[PDB]
Amino acid sequence: SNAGSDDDGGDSPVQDIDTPEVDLYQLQVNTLRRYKRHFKLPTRPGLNKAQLVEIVGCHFKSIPVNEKDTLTCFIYSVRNDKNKSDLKADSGVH
Template sequence: MLLLEDNKRCVRPAGNASYNKKIQKTVQQRHLKLNIEHSARHIYICDYHKNMIQNLRTKRKRKESEMDDSPDNDMDLPEIDFFQMPVNTLRRYKRHYKLQTRPGMNKAQLADTVARHFRTIPVVEKEATTFFIYMAKNFKSRFDTKHNMDLNS
């Protein structure tokens, strides 16, 4: 109930995201029609506006040279929202791929680092799909084999 969108008060319940300086800067840079309601007694915004602002912050436009070099720039690739993942999952990803980061990164910085790395991983779609179907049909997952061993013991 803190924000005014097109001079209309947001009626959604406030979440746990505060309208901090970073969010204010994003709103100003993107020329969003969001204003603070000064009569509000808190600085929290609803989850809808939080996600809207967060998604704008993560979708940076690539340089034209990068787009020209890309072999499949006409394909519409699905976007993964790493900001919705728990911090422990992001840390596990960072540890698995041995990503170099500075200590004390917050969740947004960690999610941005993971997203940048994830986009660089080459995937041969046909091979990945074939392997997935093979594994699903033959139940050759390490979790299934561990479960089967526990049942046989």
């Protein structure tokens, strides 16, 4: 009948793939901790690799993104500075 719900009327879209899943365990410990530091994820002391991946993955599944802008940022930075170091402290906490 339609026009009564916002659900999908195809049951299953055209996709023979189970949707590729991202392995976050491959990432370096430093990378996962960096995610937690840059996104500010307060955690308990004594974190391990598996712990990081779970926390990172849980938050990684909920990242707001925009095609045009995200592509622009990617294209821009990579064609300019491929991972710039620039060692500088922002917040003078101590």
